[PDB]
Symmetry: D2
Subunit: 258 residues, 4 copies
Amino acid sequence: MDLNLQDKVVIVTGGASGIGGAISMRLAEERAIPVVFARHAPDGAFLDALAQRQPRATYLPVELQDDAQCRDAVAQTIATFGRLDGLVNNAGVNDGIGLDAGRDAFVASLERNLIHYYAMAHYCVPHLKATRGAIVNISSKTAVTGQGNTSGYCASKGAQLALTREWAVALREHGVRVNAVIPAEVMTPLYRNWIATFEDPEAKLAEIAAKVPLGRRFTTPDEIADTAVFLLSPRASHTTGEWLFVDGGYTHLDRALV
Amino acid sequence: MDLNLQDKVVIVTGGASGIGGAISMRLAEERAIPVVFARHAPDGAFLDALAQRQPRATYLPVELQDDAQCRDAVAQTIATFGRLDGLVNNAGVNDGIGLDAGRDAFVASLERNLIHYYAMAHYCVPHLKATRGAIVNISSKTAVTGQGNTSGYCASKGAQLALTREWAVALREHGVRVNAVIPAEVMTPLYRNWIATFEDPEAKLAEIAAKVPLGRRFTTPDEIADTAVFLLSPRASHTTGEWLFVDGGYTHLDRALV
Amino acid sequence: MDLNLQDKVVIVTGGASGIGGAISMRLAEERAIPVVFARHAPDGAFLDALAQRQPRATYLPVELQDDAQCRDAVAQTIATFGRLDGLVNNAGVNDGIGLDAGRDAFVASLERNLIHYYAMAHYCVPHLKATRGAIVNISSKTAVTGQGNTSGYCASKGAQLALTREWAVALREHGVRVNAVIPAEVMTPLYRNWIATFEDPEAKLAEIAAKVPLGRRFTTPDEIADTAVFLLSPRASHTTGEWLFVDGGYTHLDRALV
Amino acid sequence: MDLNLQDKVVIVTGGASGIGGAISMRLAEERAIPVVFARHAPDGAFLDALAQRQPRATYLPVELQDDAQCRDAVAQTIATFGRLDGLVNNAGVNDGIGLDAGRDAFVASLERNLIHYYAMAHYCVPHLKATRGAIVNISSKTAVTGQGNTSGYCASKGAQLALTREWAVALREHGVRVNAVIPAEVMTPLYRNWIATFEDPEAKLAEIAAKVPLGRRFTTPDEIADTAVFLLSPRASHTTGEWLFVDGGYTHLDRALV
Ligand SMILES: NC(=O)c1ccc[n+]([C@@H]2O[C@H](COP(=O)([O-])OP(=O)(O)OC[C@H]3O[C@@H](n4cnc5c(N)ncnc54)[C@H](OP(=O)(O)O)[C@@H]3O)[C@@H](O)[C@H]2O)c1
Ligand SMILES: NC(=O)c1ccc[n+]([C@@H]2O[C@H](COP(=O)([O-])OP(=O)(O)OC[C@H]3O[C@@H](n4cnc5c(N)ncnc54)[C@H](OP(=O)(O)O)[C@@H]3O)[C@@H](O)[C@H]2O)c1
Ligand SMILES: NC(=O)c1ccc[n+]([C@@H]2O[C@H](COP(=O)([O-])OP(=O)(O)OC[C@H]3O[C@@H](n4cnc5c(N)ncnc54)[C@H](OP(=O)(O)O)[C@@H]3O)[C@@H](O)[C@H]2O)c1
Ligand SMILES: NC(=O)c1ccc[n+]([C@@H]2O[C@H](COP(=O)([O-])OP(=O)(O)OC[C@H]3O[C@@H](n4cnc5c(N)ncnc54)[C@H](OP(=O)(O)O)[C@@H]3O)[C@@H](O)[C@H]2O)c1
Ligand SMILES: C[C@@H]1O[C@H](O)[C@@H](O)[C@H](O)[C@@H]1O
Ligand SMILES: C[C@@H]1O[C@H](O)[C@@H](O)[C@H](O)[C@@H]1O
Ligand SMILES: C[C@@H]1O[C@H](O)[C@@H](O)[C@H](O)[C@@H]1O
Ligand SMILES: C[C@@H]1O[C@H](O)[C@@H](O)[C@H](O)[C@@H]1O
Ligand SMILES: [Cl-]
Ligand SMILES: [Cl-]
Ligand SMILES: [Cl-]
Ligand SMILES: [Cl-]
Ligand SMILES: [Mg+2]
Ligand SMILES: [Mg+2]
């Protein structure tokens, strides 16, 4: 299936690790031009693989919590490529800021997750209008299921779903589509670090995997990526405002199944 | 994006008109083998176009309300191709059976819409298990929005969404994925005939189109088809139980927007 | 909170057992007049309790799958009371008709569950229009979660949710509100009979109860009843089309919680 | 229907205007003790009416964006009453902070809306645990429908829905229920101030009212209040994590209906 993304310029925040890395790699495979915005330099093998698929792919160092850095990096992207066709808001961290944490920690979680999705859309939208481009926001099933001890992240992830509907409304007349992908359990460096905070990470991981209805296994980054890239493409040309769950049945199927 | 559907055998009910026709054509383009189950012979140009893309594509005359015909046609498909990789339940008719119609008419609507989705799954599932295949059910936004004067169809369409979740549960350990696509307004022969039941079809059509948030235009059959075929493919290998709205924002965006 | 249901005539199908019985009892407590439609005679102590709260409460023997019986019982209720203010569609049975069962069994499940909800609305709606009355449909979380081996029931329960939206649309100009209540696990005679089909019923029961997030216990019939009766009352005067989940968090909260 | 809220102490933020005022008044009618947290003095006639129903009803001057003020007012409420049985997070403002506004404005909208819902829960939860109390969060249909030009508010309102699920999970073992109410259009001082920003407010108002499916009229503050108070009560003892739409069908019914 031709996605007609050849030579389309797409910013992917957190685009060199986990889900974001898989999105960048799939974009490159489709001959789109992924532009990774991330705070740490990507690994060399990842950069090699990206460039082999699409030699124009690139990386810009950006701490997304710095509004000026987002501003300047979008500007640099336009200066370098002359257009912007997509934005994937993806950087995030399940930071375990619960009800006991207090205001300052809760707000810091909003900064780490929610506020840069807005900032990036704010700077990207004028350019997306020019190309009738698209936005994909990566949320989390915790936006609708909860988890415990993670008010900051949950709030952020739910806000991201609301913003998906709001931006779809706001940008409809410009032909800019805005959608979200909702993963549940995906093995990534983030998941590795999160599970490591538990008393018994090996047992806990096995416990969780056993609860995923389809295959009793975690979703892969490539599975999230392929739905995300489909949503960026004109194959989804009448899909906007939508929240696509790619989760092995985690969110919606009977909790009682084994 | 390679969908890896080459030589996969997929039954498409009502597969030579409107949405179903577009699904068959996209399957053929991807080198899958669509098998059209429908009561009236397809038009010659459609058959030509299907065969040009995939010469093994075929059509079986089936009145889906006849359980024996469904049974025998699935059997014939297995006899002819040796396997079955997908089922698209798609045949349907918005038949305007309201609260005033009475039991017999309501049940007749269930027969025209709901009951053959079950019958087809009943006969197809043993074969889908063998290939770890997939099912897509085509529902309607009326399952969640209502419409008025159409209890029979609405009930059927809502049951189809429930069956999507149920079959996803039932078949999870066999690796058979089951998903639904929810269109709102799509210009097809069905829509042409439905709108013709109104006092002023031209004005009514324009009224409705003006209410679709994205572009103030109807969704195309190709737009429904591309999401449906994506869902049949291993690119959606961890998506099951899901209801994908392809509707230009019809269902979920603020009713007040113009 | 005054519910202003005094002397309001409400038919409750299956209204003398489990959830339906609790609905009738709460209606009687609020001085409404419940009219039980059921095929078997209510327990003497139940009727005694009902009559102590509301001496005009009554029972009509009805097999709901017989259309003429529904017709005649509604006519008789109108002959007796001169009005109808509410309809609670509640009778149902989780009959375990799965994918392997075949057409005849699936349609029989529809008859046992879905079709009489339609028949009852069909016959009651003219009278509810006259009183600006209300409908409550009792569905099941299986409509959205699935369960396995129960296509007939799931389909019916999902159709009942769609019909709730459809009737809310159809009846809006007459001021007739239509809503649904979605239970998950409630201890009733049906649950006792259902759980008895399992190899170890006592253990299966405990296993299911442990998965209910709020309190690790089943919902009570009175809990379902109080939401259902609230929805019948003018305290819910702008609520229509809605599906209220009364399930201790079963449907929506993280499947992983213990 | 006895709600068993007599002498239960409930903080209502913004509890003397619009929806919050109606919630406080209904609480007082049910013999609960509403404690109004608001930055401006309540109207004299409102306080008179409140005190006639519940003479222990009180008001504490609080700017909710000041964390220390939230902290001290909760402490004072506990010093006065010795207990806290409920929290209604209600204060909010649709502040029209869109995509073009920038980071600072977006975060300010979060402060005006989202962040104090967290702060209030943070300070109230220890006390609600002690009484097995309840939380109700007032969100907005814009969380799911969007609106345009209001990213800050939409994000906040969506975060409040996610927080409802998250807190329901976090607090389940303490028997503390957490639910949300979602209004669409309600005539309040906020609505008057919001509609006044439009070029033709009277006409805009009529245009919006005509789009509400049930009765073509706005929902009343009392309608929102009665659902919110039901959710605070033990009549909703197995309802947690839920989002109750009280909107005349605005969110869920066919956008095409007139
Ligand atoms: N993994 C899951 O199971 C799962 C489930 C549901 C939703 N999600 C969502 O999926 C998204 C991606 O998650 P992931 O698991 O793929 O995470 P990941 O492997 O940690 O990748 C995220 C990348 O973003 C970077 N990043 C984070 N914050 C940044 C910032 N403020 N500025 C610049 N770069 C930043 C990270 O860098 P460093 O780590 O080196 O600092 C990392 O390279 C997140 O939004 C998450 O909420 C994940
Ligand atoms: N068009 C829309 O706006 C829209 C919106 C939401 C959902 N949908 C759903 O999309 C699906 C397809 O709709 P469509 O608009 O593409 O309809 P369509 O153009 O009429 O195509 C449906 C085909 O199925 C055939 N068919 C119907 N019932 C049959 C039966 N019992 N046995 C054998 N063949 C049968 C029809 O044949 P004949 O007509 O020649 O008899 C026709 O060829 C339906 O399930 C519908 O509910 C459509
Ligand atoms: N219990 C649960 O956990 C649960 C969960 C989700 C949804 N629900 C739903 O809640 C509703 C009530 O369930 P329940 O557990 O309270 O069941 P219940 O205790 O069996 O009560 C149902 C009553 O309806 C009667 N009935 C059934 N079919 C009838 C018919 N065709 N004609 C006349 N009377 C009929 C039954 O009579 P007989 O049995 O004597 O024949 C019985 O008295 C159902 O719609 C069910 O789907 C229940
Ligand atoms: N009205 C609607 O159509 C509608 C629809 C959907 C959702 N909602 C939601 O319903 C809730 C209540 O809305 P409403 O229409 O009833 O508004 P309202 O009449 O303006 O009442 C809100 C009250 O809260 C106060 N308040 C606001 N921010 C405060 C703060 N930071 N500190 C202390 N007090 C504060 C206001 O005081 P001052 O105004 O005097 O400063 C006012 O008294 C909001 O959360 C809103 O999002 C309303
Ligand atoms: C780190 C991961 O964050 C995700 O959003 C959650 O859905 C997973 O369960 C896990 O906690
Ligand atoms: C014929 C079509 O049926 C579909 O299901 C509906 O969604 C459309 O509005 C139209 O009535
Ligand atoms: C008998 C009961 O039927 C209900 O609908 C289900 O939700 C329960 O799990 C149980 O099977
Ligand atoms: C002021 C009101 O805010 C609410 O949240 C919205 O739902 C209404 O449409 C209106 O804008
Ligand atoms: Cl917590
Ligand atoms: Cl009707
Ligand atoms: Cl089954
Ligand atoms: Cl905007
Ligand atoms: Mg490294
Ligand atoms: Mg023809």
